[PDB]
C-alpha cells in the first residue's frame, strides 16, 4: 500500500475529485493548506518597500491505495490538475506498512478495495 | 518508531483522546479535514437532480510512537472510535526514520 | 528524498520560513494544526474543577528535500524554532519513494524543490 499526497490548485480540485470518482476511487481525505514554490525567489517588491513571497491557499488531497493502483491514480491527478503555469503542484508517494478499517477491524489485504 | 495517522468522527474524537491519555500517550497533533468514503457511490439524489457525494468534516489524529507500542495504540483508537456505521474511518501506519526534539536537539525513541 | 514534517510555535514560524529561504529552500506546504505534549500530564485544574489539557494552535511545516540536504535543513529549523521552553515542537523524518511535478510530469531529485 502507498499514501499519495497531492498539492493542487483550488480551481482544479473539483475536476481531480470527479476524475477519481469516475474510475471508482471514492475514499479520500482533503485539507485546506497554504504553500509557496520557487516563483518569487527571496523577495518581492511593494511600491517602495521589500515584501516576503506570500504563502497562498492550495488543496491537499491524501488517497491511500494498493500498490497496483498507484500509477493509475498519479495519472488521473496529473491530467486533471494540470494548467501549464508555475504553481500547478506536486505529488509525493509515501510508504504505508498497514491500514486498519475502524468499523470492521479488517487489515492488510482486506483494508482497501481491489481495482484489478 | 512509526507515525499512526487516524481519520475519525468528530463526535468520537474526545473519547479517543481520553483513551490515549489514560495509558500515558500524551503527544499528538490534530487537524480539521474533510472526507468521503464508498457510501453514496458516484452521485446522490435530489430530484431528477443529481448532486455529488459531499466531503464532510472529520478529525485527523497523528501520533508518533515506539515500534513496540504501535498495536496497543491502534486497539485504543479502534475501540473508542467505532460506531458500526459507514464513515467510522481508517488508521494508516507510516514509517518514521527519526525524530528530533527542537528544545534539546535530542533524537531517537528518547525524544518521544 | 525525505519529507521533513516540523511542528513549531506560530510566533517562530516566520523566522523558520526566512532561515530556509536564505539558504534557497523555497518550496514548502503549511497547515494550521492543534497539539499537546507531555506538559500537563493526564489533566489540570481548575476554578475549582478538573479539565482536560488543551490542544493549542501550532504551525505544521512540510518540506520534501534530497537525502543529502536533510541534516542541513534539520539544523536551520532547530536554530530558528528554538526558544528553550516545553512546547518548542518536534521534527519527523519520513521516507518518500518519489515526487512528481504536475506541470511537466518530471520525477526524482529533478522534480524538486
Ligand atoms: N519541496 C516541497 N515541499 C513541500 N511542498 C511543496 C514543495 N514544493 C512545492 N510544494 C507545494 O506545491 C505548491 C506548488 O508548487 P510548485 O508548483 O512547485 O511552484 P513553483 O513552480 O513556483 O516552484 C506549493 O505552493 C507548495 O504547497
Ligand atoms: N482510501 C482512503 N484514503 C484516504 N482517506 C480515506 C480512505 N478511505 C476513507 N478515508 C477517510 O476516512 C473517512 C471515513 O471513511 P470510511 O469509514 O471508509 O467510509 P465508507 O464506509 O463510506 O467507505 C473518509 O471520509 C475519509 O476522510
Ligand atoms: N509523539 C507525538 N506525536 C505527534 N505529535 C507530537 C508528538 N509530540 C509532540 N507533538 C506535537 O509537537 C507539539 C510540541 O510538543 P512538545 O514540544 O514535545 O511538548 P512537551 O514539551 O510538552 O512534551 C505538540 O503540541 C504536538 O503538536
Ligand atoms: Cl506522511
Ligand atoms: Mg515548484
Ligand atoms: Mg471506506
Ligand atoms: Mg513532548
Short mmCIF file of N, CA and C in Angstrom, two decimals, chain A residues 1-102:
data_model
loop_
_atom_site.label_atom_id
_atom_site.label_comp_id
_atom_site.label_asym_id
_atom_site.label_seq_id
_atom_site.Cartn_x
_atom_site.Cartn_y
_atom_site.Cartn_z
N UNK A 1 0.84 -1.24 0.00
CA UNK A 1 0.00 0.00 0.00
C UNK A 1 0.84 1.25 0.00
N UNK A 2 0.32 2.34 -0.62
CA UNK A 2 1.02 3.66 -0.57
C UNK A 2 0.04 4.78 -0.23
N UNK A 3 0.56 5.85 0.43
CA UNK A 3 -0.21 7.09 0.52
C UNK A 3 0.21 8.04 -0.59
N UNK A 4 -0.76 8.55 -1.36
CA UNK A 4 -0.46 9.50 -2.45
C UNK A 4 -0.93 10.86 -1.87
N UNK A 5 0.02 11.84 -1.74
CA UNK A 5 -0.30 13.15 -1.13
C UNK A 5 -0.08 14.18 -2.26
N UNK A 6 -1.16 14.83 -2.73
CA UNK A 6 -1.07 15.76 -3.88
C UNK A 6 -1.43 17.19 -3.37
N UNK A 7 -0.66 18.18 -3.81
CA UNK A 7 -0.98 19.57 -3.51
C UNK A 7 -1.38 20.22 -4.82
N UNK A 8 -2.68 20.62 -4.95
CA UNK A 8 -3.22 21.11 -6.24
C UNK A 8 -3.89 22.50 -6.08
N UNK A 9 -4.14 23.17 -7.23
CA UNK A 9 -4.86 24.47 -7.19
C UNK A 9 -6.33 24.23 -6.75
N UNK A 10 -6.90 25.15 -5.90
CA UNK A 10 -8.29 25.03 -5.53
C UNK A 10 -9.26 25.03 -6.74
N UNK A 11 -8.94 25.85 -7.74
CA UNK A 11 -9.73 25.93 -9.00
C UNK A 11 -9.83 24.58 -9.73
N UNK A 12 -8.79 23.72 -9.57
CA UNK A 12 -8.74 22.43 -10.29
C UNK A 12 -9.20 21.25 -9.43
N UNK A 13 -9.28 21.41 -8.08
CA UNK A 13 -9.67 20.26 -7.24
C UNK A 13 -11.03 19.59 -7.63
N UNK A 14 -12.08 20.36 -8.00
CA UNK A 14 -13.34 19.63 -8.31
C UNK A 14 -13.18 18.66 -9.54
N UNK A 15 -12.35 19.04 -10.51
CA UNK A 15 -12.11 18.13 -11.69
C UNK A 15 -11.25 16.94 -11.27
N UNK A 16 -10.29 17.10 -10.31
CA UNK A 16 -9.49 15.96 -9.79
C UNK A 16 -10.45 14.97 -9.03
N UNK A 17 -11.33 15.49 -8.14
CA UNK A 17 -12.25 14.61 -7.43
C UNK A 17 -13.15 13.82 -8.46
N UNK A 18 -13.71 14.51 -9.47
CA UNK A 18 -14.58 13.89 -10.46
C UNK A 18 -13.80 12.81 -11.24
N UNK A 19 -12.55 13.11 -11.60
CA UNK A 19 -11.73 12.14 -12.41
C UNK A 19 -11.47 10.86 -11.61
N UNK A 20 -11.20 11.04 -10.31
CA UNK A 20 -11.01 9.87 -9.42
C UNK A 20 -12.31 9.05 -9.26
N UNK A 21 -13.44 9.74 -8.99
CA UNK A 21 -14.73 9.05 -8.77
C UNK A 21 -15.18 8.28 -9.99
N UNK A 22 -14.90 8.83 -11.16
CA UNK A 22 -15.34 8.18 -12.42
C UNK A 22 -14.70 6.80 -12.58
N UNK A 23 -13.52 6.62 -11.94
CA UNK A 23 -12.82 5.31 -12.01
C UNK A 23 -12.94 4.52 -10.74
N UNK A 24 -13.88 4.93 -9.88
CA UNK A 24 -14.19 4.15 -8.66
C UNK A 24 -13.27 4.39 -7.45
N UNK A 25 -12.42 5.41 -7.51
CA UNK A 25 -11.66 5.80 -6.32
C UNK A 25 -12.50 6.78 -5.48
N UNK A 26 -13.08 6.26 -4.40
CA UNK A 26 -14.05 7.03 -3.60
C UNK A 26 -13.44 7.48 -2.30
N UNK A 27 -12.57 6.71 -1.66
CA UNK A 27 -12.08 7.14 -0.33
C UNK A 27 -10.96 8.18 -0.49
N UNK A 28 -11.09 9.32 0.18
CA UNK A 28 -10.08 10.42 0.04
C UNK A 28 -10.25 11.34 1.26
N UNK A 29 -9.13 11.97 1.64
CA UNK A 29 -9.14 12.93 2.78
C UNK A 29 -8.53 14.25 2.31
N UNK A 30 -9.21 15.38 2.56
CA UNK A 30 -8.82 16.68 1.94
C UNK A 30 -8.59 17.75 2.99
N UNK A 31 -7.52 18.55 2.86
CA UNK A 31 -7.17 19.60 3.85
C UNK A 31 -6.94 20.90 3.12
N UNK A 32 -7.43 22.02 3.67
CA UNK A 32 -7.02 23.33 3.11
C UNK A 32 -5.63 23.71 3.68
N UNK A 33 -4.66 24.05 2.81
CA UNK A 33 -3.32 24.35 3.21
C UNK A 33 -2.86 25.64 2.54
N UNK A 34 -1.62 26.09 2.84
CA UNK A 34 -1.02 27.23 2.10
C UNK A 34 0.36 26.80 1.64
N UNK A 35 0.87 27.41 0.59
CA UNK A 35 2.19 27.00 0.13
C UNK A 35 2.86 28.08 -0.70
N UNK A 36 4.18 27.92 -0.85
CA UNK A 36 4.88 28.66 -1.94
C UNK A 36 5.80 27.66 -2.62
N UNK A 37 6.31 28.12 -3.76
CA UNK A 37 7.25 27.31 -4.60
C UNK A 37 8.44 28.22 -4.89
N UNK A 38 9.16 27.92 -5.98
CA UNK A 38 10.26 28.75 -6.38
C UNK A 38 9.88 30.17 -6.86
N UNK A 39 8.69 30.30 -7.47
CA UNK A 39 8.28 31.62 -8.07
C UNK A 39 8.35 32.76 -7.03
N UNK A 40 9.06 33.85 -7.39
CA UNK A 40 9.28 34.97 -6.48
C UNK A 40 10.69 35.07 -5.85
N UNK A 41 11.44 33.95 -5.87
CA UNK A 41 12.78 33.86 -5.24
C UNK A 41 12.72 34.31 -3.78
N UNK A 42 13.68 35.13 -3.37
CA UNK A 42 13.76 35.51 -1.95
C UNK A 42 12.77 36.58 -1.49
N UNK A 43 12.39 37.46 -2.41
CA UNK A 43 11.60 38.62 -2.06
C UNK A 43 10.94 39.24 -3.27
N UNK A 44 9.95 40.06 -2.94
CA UNK A 44 9.07 40.72 -3.88
C UNK A 44 9.14 42.23 -3.57
N UNK A 45 8.44 43.00 -4.38
CA UNK A 45 8.55 44.45 -4.50
C UNK A 45 7.20 45.16 -4.27
N UNK A 46 6.95 45.78 -3.12
CA UNK A 46 5.68 46.51 -2.99
C UNK A 46 5.78 48.01 -2.92
N UNK A 47 5.80 48.59 -4.12
CA UNK A 47 5.87 50.02 -4.38
C UNK A 47 6.64 50.81 -3.31
N UNK A 48 7.94 50.63 -3.36
CA UNK A 48 8.81 51.25 -2.41
C UNK A 48 9.54 50.26 -1.56
N UNK A 49 8.82 49.41 -0.83
CA UNK A 49 9.45 48.56 0.16
C UNK A 49 9.60 47.11 -0.27
N UNK A 50 10.45 46.43 0.47
CA UNK A 50 10.63 44.97 0.30
C UNK A 50 9.45 44.18 1.00
N UNK A 51 8.95 43.10 0.36
CA UNK A 51 7.88 42.21 0.89
C UNK A 51 8.27 40.71 0.72
N UNK A 52 7.97 39.84 1.70
CA UNK A 52 8.18 38.37 1.53
C UNK A 52 7.25 37.78 0.42
N UNK A 53 7.64 36.64 -0.13
CA UNK A 53 6.77 35.90 -1.04
C UNK A 53 5.67 35.26 -0.20
N UNK A 54 4.42 35.42 -0.67
CA UNK A 54 3.23 35.04 0.08
C UNK A 54 2.97 33.52 0.03
N UNK A 55 2.61 32.94 1.18
CA UNK A 55 2.05 31.54 1.13
C UNK A 55 0.57 31.69 0.72
N UNK A 56 0.15 31.08 -0.37
CA UNK A 56 -1.22 31.21 -0.94
C UNK A 56 -2.03 29.92 -0.72
N UNK A 57 -3.38 30.02 -0.71
CA UNK A 57 -4.17 28.79 -0.48
C UNK A 57 -4.02 27.73 -1.56
N UNK A 58 -3.98 26.44 -1.16
CA UNK A 58 -3.97 25.30 -2.11
C UNK A 58 -4.83 24.21 -1.46
N UNK A 59 -5.12 23.12 -2.18
CA UNK A 59 -5.87 21.97 -1.59
C UNK A 59 -4.94 20.78 -1.53
N UNK A 60 -4.84 20.17 -0.35
CA UNK A 60 -4.10 18.86 -0.16
C UNK A 60 -5.07 17.70 -0.24
N UNK A 61 -4.81 16.76 -1.16
CA UNK A 61 -5.57 15.51 -1.29
C UNK A 61 -4.65 14.36 -0.76
N UNK A 62 -5.17 13.49 0.13
CA UNK A 62 -4.49 12.26 0.52
C UNK A 62 -5.39 11.10 0.15
N UNK A 63 -4.83 10.17 -0.60
CA UNK A 63 -5.58 8.93 -1.04
C UNK A 63 -4.66 7.71 -0.86
N UNK A 64 -5.08 6.75 -0.01
CA UNK A 64 -4.23 5.52 0.24
C UNK A 64 -4.83 4.39 -0.61
N UNK A 65 -3.96 3.76 -1.43
CA UNK A 65 -4.39 2.71 -2.41
C UNK A 65 -3.42 1.53 -2.40
N UNK A 66 -3.89 0.41 -2.98
CA UNK A 66 -2.98 -0.75 -3.15
C UNK A 66 -1.83 -0.41 -4.07
N UNK A 67 -0.70 -1.12 -3.91
CA UNK A 67 0.49 -0.83 -4.80
C UNK A 67 0.11 -0.86 -6.30
N UNK A 68 -0.76 -1.81 -6.69
CA UNK A 68 -1.17 -1.96 -8.13
C UNK A 68 -2.06 -0.84 -8.71
N UNK A 69 -2.42 0.16 -7.88
CA UNK A 69 -3.26 1.28 -8.34
C UNK A 69 -2.51 2.61 -8.31
N UNK A 70 -1.24 2.60 -7.85
CA UNK A 70 -0.51 3.90 -7.67
C UNK A 70 -0.29 4.69 -8.97
N UNK A 71 0.23 3.98 -10.00
CA UNK A 71 0.46 4.70 -11.29
C UNK A 71 -0.84 5.21 -11.92
N UNK A 72 -1.94 4.44 -11.82
CA UNK A 72 -3.22 4.89 -12.36
C UNK A 72 -3.69 6.19 -11.65
N UNK A 73 -3.58 6.21 -10.34
CA UNK A 73 -4.07 7.39 -9.65
C UNK A 73 -3.20 8.60 -9.89
N UNK A 74 -1.87 8.43 -9.88
CA UNK A 74 -0.95 9.58 -10.24
C UNK A 74 -1.42 10.17 -11.61
N UNK A 75 -1.62 9.31 -12.66
CA UNK A 75 -2.09 9.85 -13.98
C UNK A 75 -3.37 10.61 -13.90
N UNK A 76 -4.34 10.07 -13.17
CA UNK A 76 -5.66 10.78 -13.09
C UNK A 76 -5.49 12.17 -12.46
N UNK A 77 -4.64 12.25 -11.43
CA UNK A 77 -4.46 13.55 -10.72
C UNK A 77 -3.66 14.49 -11.65
N UNK A 78 -2.56 13.99 -12.24
CA UNK A 78 -1.78 14.91 -13.14
C UNK A 78 -2.61 15.47 -14.31
N UNK A 79 -3.42 14.61 -14.93
CA UNK A 79 -4.14 15.06 -16.16
C UNK A 79 -5.35 15.97 -15.84
N UNK A 80 -5.87 15.90 -14.61
CA UNK A 80 -6.98 16.78 -14.17
C UNK A 80 -6.49 18.08 -13.47
N UNK A 81 -5.29 18.04 -12.85
CA UNK A 81 -4.81 19.23 -12.10
C UNK A 81 -3.97 20.19 -12.96
N UNK A 82 -3.50 19.69 -14.10
CA UNK A 82 -2.56 20.48 -14.93
C UNK A 82 -3.21 21.77 -15.49
N UNK A 83 -2.42 22.85 -15.51
CA UNK A 83 -2.77 24.06 -16.33
C UNK A 83 -1.62 24.53 -17.20
N UNK A 84 -0.37 24.20 -16.86
CA UNK A 84 0.79 24.74 -17.63
C UNK A 84 1.64 25.85 -17.03
N UNK A 85 1.15 26.47 -15.95
CA UNK A 85 1.80 27.65 -15.29
C UNK A 85 2.50 27.24 -14.00
N UNK A 86 3.58 27.95 -13.59
CA UNK A 86 4.17 27.71 -12.25
C UNK A 86 3.08 27.80 -11.14
N UNK A 87 3.13 26.86 -10.17
CA UNK A 87 2.13 26.78 -9.09
C UNK A 87 1.14 25.59 -9.30
N UNK A 88 1.32 24.73 -10.34
CA UNK A 88 0.39 23.59 -10.55
C UNK A 88 0.45 22.47 -9.47
N UNK A 89 1.60 22.34 -8.75
CA UNK A 89 1.66 21.44 -7.60
C UNK A 89 2.52 20.22 -7.80
N UNK A 90 2.56 19.41 -6.77
CA UNK A 90 3.46 18.24 -6.75
C UNK A 90 2.72 17.07 -6.10
N UNK A 91 3.13 15.83 -6.42
CA UNK A 91 2.60 14.62 -5.78
C UNK A 91 3.75 13.89 -5.06
N UNK A 92 3.55 13.47 -3.80
CA UNK A 92 4.57 12.70 -3.06
C UNK A 92 3.99 11.29 -2.83
N UNK A 93 4.84 10.28 -3.02
CA UNK A 93 4.43 8.85 -2.85
C UNK A 93 5.13 8.38 -1.55
N UNK A 94 4.32 8.03 -0.51
CA UNK A 94 4.88 7.69 0.80
C UNK A 94 4.49 6.25 1.19
N UNK A 95 5.48 5.47 1.69
CA UNK A 95 5.14 4.06 2.06
C UNK A 95 4.11 3.98 3.23
N UNK A 96 3.19 3.02 3.12
CA UNK A 96 2.28 2.71 4.24
C UNK A 96 2.46 1.23 4.61
N UNK A 97 2.77 0.92 5.89
CA UNK A 97 3.07 -0.52 6.22
C UNK A 97 1.81 -1.36 6.53
N UNK A 98 0.73 -0.68 6.99
CA UNK A 98 -0.56 -1.33 7.22
C UNK A 98 -1.70 -0.32 7.27
N UNK A 99 -2.94 -0.79 7.09
CA UNK A 99 -4.13 0.06 7.17
C UNK A 99 -5.16 -0.74 7.96
N UNK A 100 -5.87 -0.09 8.91
CA UNK A 100 -6.95 -0.76 9.64
C UNK A 100 -8.27 -0.03 9.36
N UNK A 101 -9.34 -0.80 9.05
CA UNK A 101 -10.68 -0.22 8.92
C UNK A 101 -11.31 -0.22 10.29
N UNK A 102 -11.71 0.96 10.78
CA UNK A 102 -12.21 1.04 12.14
C UNK A 102 -13.55 0.25 12.35
#
